[PDB]
Structure 1
Amino acid sequence: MSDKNSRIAIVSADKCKPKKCRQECKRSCPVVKTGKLCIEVTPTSKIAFISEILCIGCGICVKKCPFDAIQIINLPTNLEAHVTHRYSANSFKLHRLPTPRPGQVLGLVGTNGIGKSTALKILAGKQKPNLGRFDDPPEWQEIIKYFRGSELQNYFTKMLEDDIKAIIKPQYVDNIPRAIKGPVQKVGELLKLRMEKSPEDVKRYIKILQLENVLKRDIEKLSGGELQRFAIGMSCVQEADVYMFDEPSSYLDVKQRLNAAQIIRSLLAPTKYVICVEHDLSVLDYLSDFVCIIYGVPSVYGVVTLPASVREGINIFLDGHIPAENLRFRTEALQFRIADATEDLQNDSASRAFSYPSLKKTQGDFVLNVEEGEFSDSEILVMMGENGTGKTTLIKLLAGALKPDEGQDIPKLNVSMKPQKIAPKFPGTVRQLFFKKIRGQFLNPQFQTDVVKPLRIDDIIDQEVQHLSGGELQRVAIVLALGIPADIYLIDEPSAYLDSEQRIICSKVIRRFILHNKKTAFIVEHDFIMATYLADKVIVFEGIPSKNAHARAPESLLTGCNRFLKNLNVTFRRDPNSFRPRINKLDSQMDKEQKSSGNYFFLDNTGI
């Protein structure tokens, strides 16, 4: 007959105020009219509760809700089979979990809110899964049963017995500074205590990670990239079998994230089990032997797929569709402009834009050098390189925030600027802040697509910025820079705290407005793909981090990309199906052939 279906309702309490509506949910529902149970009022917490058993799937309640607090979805009973854990009534529920394997590295990739973080806790022994039920007083026993038919069953027996104690590298990057000071006192102390391994391990681990400078600094003092790496150090130093990493690429620069990936992989060689979660595909590919994909709506649900190969899992990810599950997880496919695709205009505007001379900025501990370059109108320039190179310093000077030690840049131009690390320091609510900058930008349809509808800022409008979240704040900041008119716009590292969909919304944003408005933009980035889409020229930075650095004039996309990628020595041939960068291993004949051609990347362009 007909296929089977279900109803699931998740309500957000933040969005709900029963006083204004009245308990309208109960009154409007047709089941309750009849005298049924579908919506029950909880006198206590004073929240509406919707029971999935009695609900019709009508959706009448959803429309009537004045805010948009209720969500009812109909699924083919895809979710019911898999239930691992649920937070509570009408809240996030997790489905499936990632397999662990000894001697190898298993990847995880998904959009935020999927339960990748939750999954780690369950494997860690930190949290016990309720099984979408009562299971609470240590009922590890029931969890093995639920896992039967899955390879995780063996793991759960091991965890309960406590033969193995997993080491976890904590996920939330913002939270860590508050938790630890010193580790107690200074990063160096942490590394000495934790070092179960070789005395060589202390030195070796620090050298490879580029921690040398950072040892004396305290944890609270650390910058985001530095903060991440110390955590990684402790996860090598520890003695154990299972090493869990949760988002190790966060905050890190392009050079550093690759470095972290290699070191982490070394664990597999000692035949120690490794698990990892990543937002970055370049990093994910290198680390993993096996990959899981986590999909589903954010904060509603997230299911883990069956284990897959490294190459295979990545390929399926980019399609935006999964066949067994039969879900189009992402509404639109990701594509990069060919450069054939772009509009052809004679560019200058007023003959070229402004130009800067050689600049120098010296702190007295770090020195930045800049080579005279030129900027033109309606163009976009990417800035790449490792952090501590003075990528941030350079942008500031152009902003006029910083004064150069030598050189000068006094432009007539009006500048809008977005800072790299965003910490709130503005009193006021989110809507008020954005309205002051510009209203009318808020009216535009473009802004509805990218900001307002996806996150639901309407709910955020009353919330304080101190009270806010990381990724949500990021999209808002990028948009705000665009809020006001300026000849030149400056953005620094827009990719931070953002998942796949979120960054790509940003990529479309910068390119489209700049093209249209005929204004120029400088964007700093670590993400390969984001730079490619937005830019026409690039500046590459080089030197040694935390010591000195150098900048170059803007150069074409092909030219700049070869230089940058030559510093890394990883080529990204091309995958014929995905058109994705495909990484090339060191000493090789195929990779060797490329080195003689000068092609690090490939696109829909002519080339051998």
Structure 2
Amino acid sequence: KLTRIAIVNHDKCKPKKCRQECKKSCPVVRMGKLCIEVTPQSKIAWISETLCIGCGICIKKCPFGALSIVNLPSNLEKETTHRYCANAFKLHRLPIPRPGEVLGLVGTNGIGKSTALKILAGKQKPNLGKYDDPPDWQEILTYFRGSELQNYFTKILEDDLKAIIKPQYVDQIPKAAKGTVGSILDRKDETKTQAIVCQQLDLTHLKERNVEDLSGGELQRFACAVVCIQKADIFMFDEPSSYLDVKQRLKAAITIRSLINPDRYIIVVEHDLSVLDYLSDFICCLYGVPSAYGVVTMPFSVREGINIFLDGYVPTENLRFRDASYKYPGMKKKMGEFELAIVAGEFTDSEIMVMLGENGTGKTTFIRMLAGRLKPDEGGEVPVLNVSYKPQKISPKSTGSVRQLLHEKIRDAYTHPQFVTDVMKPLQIENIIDQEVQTLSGGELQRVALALCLGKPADVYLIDEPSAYLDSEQRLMAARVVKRFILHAKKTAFVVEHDFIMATYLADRVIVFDGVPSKNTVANSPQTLLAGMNKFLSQLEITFRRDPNNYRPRINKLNSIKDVEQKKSGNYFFLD
């Protein structure tokens, strides 16, 4: 049974004129435990959130009716679809797929959004919340009885609707993929189109490098190609804006809608949600306590389902799930294919540097030569002291738990206090410190690897890509983590980002990577935040815009009334 909570709005609740009938009618007040505390000298009633029993007595006893009853989510075990193990995560509901349109799934991380894909694609038979004695496919098809899906799963069981997924963990694919991009992509096409899939995804300039050659941006866009040529009907796109810049995110969004025949089944799952208005037609939402249970809501429309989620209150249920709305010279590397000619630029202490790049522009080569590796030109600065370095792709190899790995292999004599209250307590790795690092998903893997790179003392922090594999909620948490750490440690740091809202917030100083994308590159002298974004967004020819109330960066339509009047003045984003 859902927990119900009494909810007061601020308007039409003027407490001086209506004689405080809500407090005097409540049963919990009439023992003396104060769920309601009002006075006639006040501006609002305050109903307590853990002392309300949710019994609905206070609602009818109000003169200017302002009091609503609102569900708060709980463990329900009502129409459970799949539970993974003993004392483990429980996926309650199944999403409904639809022909010929795109389905988006937004929410938090660790809530079950990839597990929903594996059940709808034939990759799992769910055990219906019963892990000892799993029911088999006959009795699964009598539990979705009276729904559409016991026809749809019958198409899965005889393979009348073929299901191919794009994997969430995109960095690990060349371990089962050997050779060249020309051979491994083109032997498995099974439709010889070969013409739109590269030009919509900016490819055939990467086709004689190896599959092991690519950095994480180009590693991502290869996998979007390998699902799209294939002949099937059911496609699931796991986090397709991971490791990508904004210009390639729109091209990935357009090609997903080029996979629509009206008989094809496309659902996607996003955490970026500024191309989601250009990417999907209907959006389901996943609430719950993270990794204890997750439930799928009903599908809402594109513009509708976002603004429902950003307030965090679902209107088709009455459920509320959230109340919150010093000098280095320039050099040439050429690894094997193309050079990056850095222009010699200045450098500071106790300031922040943000790399603004493209898919193959040289960000993960410039963060290596600051650690003193791969230096074929004479000169280039060596730092005096040891350096912290985060890798792009963390393929971990460890022993046992993270309490051996974090707490007794780096700073065994700890730096708490003060280490944990400033850094570790918002980063929330004390809950997952019991679990081993080898079973981890990509959200916790990225979150645990930052803890060492902040936890190491060094002079220059090489930090790259914190906005991979995380949700939208803990991406502004990382910003106050890094801003309050290095400007109170008085050291400086290299931060490397793809996301627009993260890179705008921190940046003291800006390093721009100009030139032709992935064929000849130049890293410019360090510019300011105002001209640095407004030059770089003139290289995208893409203009951003704040939604005025939840501060969300939204992208203008390409030739529009807002876009050409912003590209005229060159303010590609106001107040950077």
Same structural fold, with TM-score higher than 0.5 when normalized by the shorter chain: yes
2:369 to 374, 377, 397: 397
The change in CA–CA distance for 1:440 and 1:524 in structure 2 (over 3 A counts) is: same
The change in CA–CA distance for 1:296 and 1:76 in structure 2 (over 3 A counts) is: closer
Q: Using the TM superposition, give the Cα deviation of residue 275 of structure 1 relative to its aligned residue in structure 2, in angstroms.
A: 0.9
SS across alignment from 1:570: coil
Greater percentage in helix: 1
Is 1:265 aligned to 2:237, yes or no?
no
Number of the residue aligned with 1:229 = 221
Partner Cα separation in structure 2 for residue 189 and residue 97 of structure 1: 37
Partner Cα separation in structure 2 for residue 268 and residue 489 of structure 1: 45
SS across alignment from 2:271: coil
Partner Cα separation in structure 2 for residue 395 and residue 88 of structure 1: 41
Q: Using the TM superposition, give the Cα deviation of residue 555 of structure 1 relative to its aligned residue in structure 2, in angstroms.
A: 2.2
Number of the residue aligned with 2:231 = 239
Partner Cα separation in structure 2 for residue 477 and residue 563 of structure 1: 33
The change in CA–CA distance for 1:160 and 1:100 in structure 2 (over 3 A counts) is: same
Q: Give the residue type in structure 1 aligned to 2:81.
A: T
Q: Using the TM superposition, give the Cα deviation of residue 329 of structure 1 relative to its aligned residue in structure 2, in angstroms.
A: 4.1
Number of the residue aligned with 1:194 = 188
Is 1:456 aligned to 2:428, yes or no?
no
Number of the residue aligned with 1:564 = 536
Q: Give the residue type in structure 2 aligned to 1:181.
A: A
Does structure 2 conserve the Cα–Cα contact (< 8 Å) formed by 1:190 and 1:234?
Answer: no
1:168 to 152, 158, 165: 165
Does structure 2 conserve the Cα–Cα contact (< 8 Å) formed by 1:538 and 1:554?
Answer: yes
Number of the residue aligned with 1:141 = 141
Does structure 2 conserve the Cα–Cα contact (< 8 Å) formed by 1:96 and 1:304?
Answer: yes
Does structure 1 conserve the Cα–Cα contact (< 8 Å) formed by 2:141 and 2:150?
Answer: no
User: What pairs with 1:205-216 in structure 2 (closer than 5 Å)?
Assistant: 205-216=197-208
Is 1:431 aligned to 2:431, yes or no?
no
Q: Give the residue type in structure 2 aligned to 1:600.
A: Y
Partner Cα separation in structure 1 for residue 278 and residue 321 of structure 2: 24
Number of the residue aligned with 2:102 = 105
Q: Using the TM superposition, give the Cα deviation of residue 445 of structure 1 relative to its aligned residue in structure 2, in angstroms.
A: 0.8
The change in CA–CA distance for 1:566 and 1:272 in structure 2 (over 3 A counts) is: farther
Partner Cα separation in structure 1 for residue 298 and residue 307 of structure 2: 15
Between 539-548 and 431-440, the greater mean CA deviation after superposition? 431-440
Does structure 1 conserve the Cα–Cα contact (< 8 Å) formed by 2:121 and 2:234?
Answer: no
Number of the residue aligned with 1:31 = none
Partner Cα separation in structure 2 for residue 215 and residue 393 of structure 1: 20
Number of the residue aligned with 2:341 = 369
Spell out, residue by residue over 1:518-569, the C-alpha distance to the aligned partner (whole angstroms, 9 max, x if none).
3322201111121122212222213334322111222222222222222222
1:440 to 409, 413, 416: 416
Partner Cα separation in structure 2 for residue 331 and residue 407 of structure 1: 54
Q: Which runs of 5+ in 1 are unaligned?
A: 7-73, 334-353
SS across alignment from 2:450: helix
Q: Using the TM superposition, give the Cα deviation of residue 407 of structure 1 relative to its aligned residue in structure 2, in angstroms.
A: 4.2
Does structure 2 conserve the Cα–Cα contact (< 8 Å) formed by 1:255 and 1:385?
Answer: no
Is 1:130 aligned to 2:140, yes or no?
no
The change in CA–CA distance for 1:268 and 1:558 in structure 2 (over 3 A counts) is: farther
SS across alignment from 2:283: strand
Partner Cα separation in structure 1 for residue 218 and residue 494 of structure 2: 25
SS across alignment from 2:476: helix
Partner Cα separation in structure 1 for residue 239 and residue 488 of structure 2: 36
SS across alignment from 2:332: strand
Spell out, residue by residue over 1:162-192, the C-alpha distance to the aligned partner (whole angstroms, 9 max, x if none).
43222222333355444x233xx54433433
Q: Using the TM superposition, give the Cα deviation of residue 441 of structure 1 relative to its aligned residue in structure 2, in angstroms.
A: 6.2
The change in CA–CA distance for 1:486 and 1:301 in structure 2 (over 3 A counts) is: same
The change in CA–CA distance for 1:582 and 1:223 in structure 2 (over 3 A counts) is: closer
SS across alignment from 1:558: helix
Partner Cα separation in structure 1 for residue 544 and residue 358 of structure 2: 19
Q: Give the residue type in structure 2 aligned to 1:517.
A: A
The change in CA–CA distance for 1:550 and 1:128 in structure 2 (over 3 A counts) is: same
The change in CA–CA distance for 1:357 and 1:4 in structure 2 (over 3 A counts) is: closer
Q: Give the residue type in structure 1 aligned to 2:170.
A: V
The change in CA–CA distance for 1:319 and 1:449 in structure 2 (over 3 A counts) is: farther
Q: Using the TM superposition, give the Cα deviation of residue 581 of structure 1 relative to its aligned residue in structure 2, in angstroms.
A: 1.4
Is 1:85 aligned to 2:82, yes or no?
yes
Partner Cα separation in structure 1 for residue 555 and residue 263 of structure 2: 24
Partner Cα separation in structure 1 for residue 204 and residue 386 of structure 2: 40
Does structure 2 conserve the Cα–Cα contact (< 8 Å) formed by 1:367 and 1:549?
Answer: yes
Partner Cα separation in structure 1 for residue 460 and residue 215 of structure 2: 28
Partner Cα separation in structure 1 for residue 137 and residue 293 of structure 2: 24
Does structure 2 conserve the Cα–Cα contact (< 8 Å) formed by 1:357 and 1:373?
Answer: yes
1:552 to 509, 524, 534: 524
Number of the residue aligned with 1:275 = 267
Is 1:498 aligned to 2:470, yes or no?
yes
Does structure 1 conserve the Cα–Cα contact (< 8 Å) formed by 2:542 and 2:556?
Answer: yes
SS across alignment from 2:196: helix
The change in CA–CA distance for 1:567 and 1:154 in structure 2 (over 3 A counts) is: farther
SS across alignment from 1:204: coil
Does structure 2 conserve the Cα–Cα contact (< 8 Å) formed by 1:94 and 1:302?
Answer: yes
Q: Using the TM superposition, give the Cα deviation of residue 380 of structure 1 relative to its aligned residue in structure 2, in angstroms.
A: 1.0
Number of the residue aligned with 1:181 = 177
SS across alignment from 2:284: strand
Number of the residue aligned with 2:483 = 511
Partner Cα separation in structure 2 for residue 434 and residue 323 of structure 1: 48
Q: Give the residue type in structure 1 aligned to 2:144.
A: I
Number of the residue aligned with 2:390 = 418
The change in CA–CA distance for 1:552 and 1:186 in structure 2 (over 3 A counts) is: closer
Number of the residue aligned with 1:318 = 310
2:506 to 520, 524, 534: 534
* Percent identity for Structure 1 against Structure 2: 63
Q: Using the TM superposition, give the Cα deviation of residue 575 of structure 1 relative to its aligned residue in structure 2, in angstroms.
A: 1.8
Spell out, residue by residue over 1:401-423, the C-alpha distance to the aligned partner (whole angstroms, 9 max, x if none).
34251442245466433232223
Does structure 2 conserve the Cα–Cα contact (< 8 Å) formed by 1:397 and 1:403?
Answer: yes
Partner Cα separation in structure 1 for residue 149 and residue 536 of structure 2: 42
Number of the residue aligned with 1:52 = none
How many residues are matched?
503
Number of the residue aligned with 2:13 = none
Number of the residue aligned with 1:117 = 114
TM-score of the superposed pair, with normalisation by structure 1: 0.74
Does structure 2 conserve the Cα–Cα contact (< 8 Å) formed by 1:380 and 1:523?
Answer: yes
User: What pairs with 1:313-352 in structure 2 (closer than 5 Å)?
Assistant: 313-323=305-315, 329=321, 333=325
Partner Cα separation in structure 1 for residue 264 and residue 102 of structure 2: 9
Number of the residue aligned with 1:298 = 290
Partner Cα separation in structure 2 for residue 280 and residue 169 of structure 1: 17
Does structure 2 conserve the Cα–Cα contact (< 8 Å) formed by 1:475 and 1:506?
Answer: no
Spell out, residue by residue over 1:336-394, the C-alpha distance to the aligned partner (whole angstroms, 9 max, x if none).
xxxxxxxxxxxxxxxxxx23333333335221122232223321121121242111222
Q: Give the residue type in structure 1 aligned to 2:433.
A: D
